[PDB]
Design a protein around this ligand. Structure first.
Ligand code: HEM
Length: 289
């Protein structure tokens, strides 16, 4: 099973920078969503969930086919709340109907991270929409009620090692949980990409509490929360070392996150040797827009 990247006919960097700019301007303008967090975090989550279905064993799932547009995947209980991100992107797809679905969903994540003052994430085009029968079954995305061993084992399916896992989890500096989506009660939230997830894990006095959906989560008197899978990163000695590293080196975190997130978004895709190089998009701020 091979998925070969194929550049949307005649398109080049300038075309994709236009799409980036459209997403970025809408992020700036539709700022009220989710109590003024805006759409950045949900777009990051969307890009991760469309990629996180991948299975290295058989090359099924992943971002290539844009299969989230089909009912089976759209309605996965693990994807509750992502409809908001899909709705955000729909008008942009109408404006740029030539872009593939997987390219749009992945580019939305890239755009969001950069516009939230995160690292630059190189991005490659050429995902191709695949038919409804290529849609992975539900249940490939991870549960939040588990321990470090679960996290480690889960991420082996995505060909991610312990450093890649800890870097990726730093995206939990962004946004929040919502009881109605996931059964976890949200805490303090931000929409600026920093290494604060790691600082909070190490510095707060966490208490194991039960929420109104009868799930356990870790809460602090400061008003922050951690999922069990978040907290696992300080219970496991290998993960803890890496958490400390990123707490103490913002730049290292940014660089490691950039590499792991690009990898996540490209898993399963074969890029021909004459494919274009990855694009690095300018932010609105860099363009004076
Ligand atoms: C073991 C792995 C993971 C688990 C169990 C997990 C679990 C969750 C849960 C339960 C939520 C709350 C959903 C809601 O209630 O709206 C969430 C939100 C989020 N996750 Fe994860 N996550 C994991 C890994 C990741 C990774 C790898 C990324 C990206 C690189 C990511 C990015 C996010 C973002 C940005 C949000 C916030 C969305 C919002 O504010 O609407 N997560 N995650």
């Amino acid at each position: 099973l091979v998925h070969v990247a194929s550049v949307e006919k005649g398109r080049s960097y300038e075309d994709f920078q236009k799409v980036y700019n459209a997403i970025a301007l809408k992020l700036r303008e539709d700022d009220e969503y989710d109590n003024y967090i805006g759409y950045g975090p949900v777009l990051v989550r969307l890009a991760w969930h469309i990629s996180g279905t991948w299975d290295k064993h058989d090359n099924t799932g992943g971002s290539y086919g844009g299969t989230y547009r089909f009912k089976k995947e759209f309605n996965d209980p693990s994807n509750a709340g992502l409809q908001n991100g899909f709705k955000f992107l729909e008008p942009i797809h109408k404006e740029f109907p030539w872009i593939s679905s997987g390219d749009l969903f992945s580019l939305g994540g890239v755009t969001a991270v950069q516009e939230m003052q995160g690292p630059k994430i190189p991005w490659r085009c050429g995902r191709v929409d695949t038919p409804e029968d290529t849609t992975p079954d539900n249940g490939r995305l991870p549960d939040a009620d588990k321990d470090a061993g679960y996290v480690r084992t889960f991420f082996q399916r995505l060909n991610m090692n312990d450093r890649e896992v800890v870097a990726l989890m730093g995206a939990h500096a962004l946004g929040k949980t919502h009881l109605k989506n996931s059964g976890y009660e949200g805490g303090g939230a931000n929409n600026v990409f920093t290494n604060e997830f790691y600082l909070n894990l190490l510095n707060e006095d966490w208490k194991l509490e039960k929420n109104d959906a009868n799930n356990e989560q870790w809460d602090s008197k400061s008003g922050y929360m951690m999922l069990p899978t978040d907290y696992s990163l300080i219970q496991d000695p290998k993960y803890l070392s890496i958490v400390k590293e990123y707490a103490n080196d913002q730049d290292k975190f940014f660089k490691d996150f950039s590499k792991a997130f690009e990898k996540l978004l490209e898993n399963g895709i074969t890029f021909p040797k004459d494919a274009p190089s990855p694009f690095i998009f300018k932010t609105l701020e860099e363009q004076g827009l």
